[PDB]
């Protein structure tokens, strides 16, 4: 299965920026074969706790090709465990060989390929190793427990 994301017409000022997002992950909501870009999109940064709670309710998808009309994807885990693919890192800590990776909402915002023509923005989640994602969740949940 190959999720197909269709694109509206785009200005060359942002199509070439979207081309550079060839190894990042997006979050659909339903696994139909076709889906428009407008559907798979999250609002600008806010409430990293809420977002992290939202990643549980949707299954991920990584994209591979970006054509002037069409942009493919791949539903990450629904029936497969060995579909070797490639995805680019966007978290601060460099991830080494051997360990697993977990998706975490971005901090400070500022990571938004704001598309003006389509009037929408995307926030691709960052990728951290397990050992540090656990600690980050610990810190954020403890801070939430501080406010009664």
């Amino acid at each position: 299965m190959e999720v197909d994301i269709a694109l509206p017409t785009l200005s060359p000022g942002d199509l070439s920026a979207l081309q550079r997002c060839e190894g990042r992950v997006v979050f659909l909501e339903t696994l139909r074969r076709h889906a428009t870009l407008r559907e798979v999109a999250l609002p600008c940064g806010g409430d990293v706790l809420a977002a992290m709670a939202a990643y549980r309710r949707r299954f991920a998808a990584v994209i591979t090709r970006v054509t002037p009309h069409r942009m493919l994807a791949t539903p990450l885990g629904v029936g497969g465990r060995g579909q070797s693919l490639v995805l680019q890192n966007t978290g601060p800590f460099d991830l080494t060989n051997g360990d697993h990776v977990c998706l975490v909402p971005p901090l400070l915002g500022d990571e938004c390929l704001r598309l003006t023509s389509a009037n929408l923005e995307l926030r691709f989640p960052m990728t951290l190793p397990l050992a540090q994602a656990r600690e980050l969740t610990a810190r954020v949940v403890a801070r939430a427990a501080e406010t009664l």
């Binding site: 269709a6 017409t9 002037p68 009309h69 069409r70």
Partner: protein
């Protein structure tokens, strides 16, 4: 006052769409067409047709 003749250029950008239509076929027919699930009888070809 008099007025000069006026010129003007312009451009229109395309609009692009796409179509799709599925064609799913069965596994039994897939095995019978090629011959991977064939049989040497007179009943097999009766179903391959």
């Amino acid at each position: 006052p008099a007025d000069q003749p006026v010129h003007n250029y312009m451009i229109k950008r395309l609009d692009r769409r796409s179509l799709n239509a599925a064609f799913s076929i069965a596994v039994e027919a897939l095995g019978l067409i090629s011959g991977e699930n064939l049989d040497g009888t007179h009943i097999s070809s009766a179903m391959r047709l």
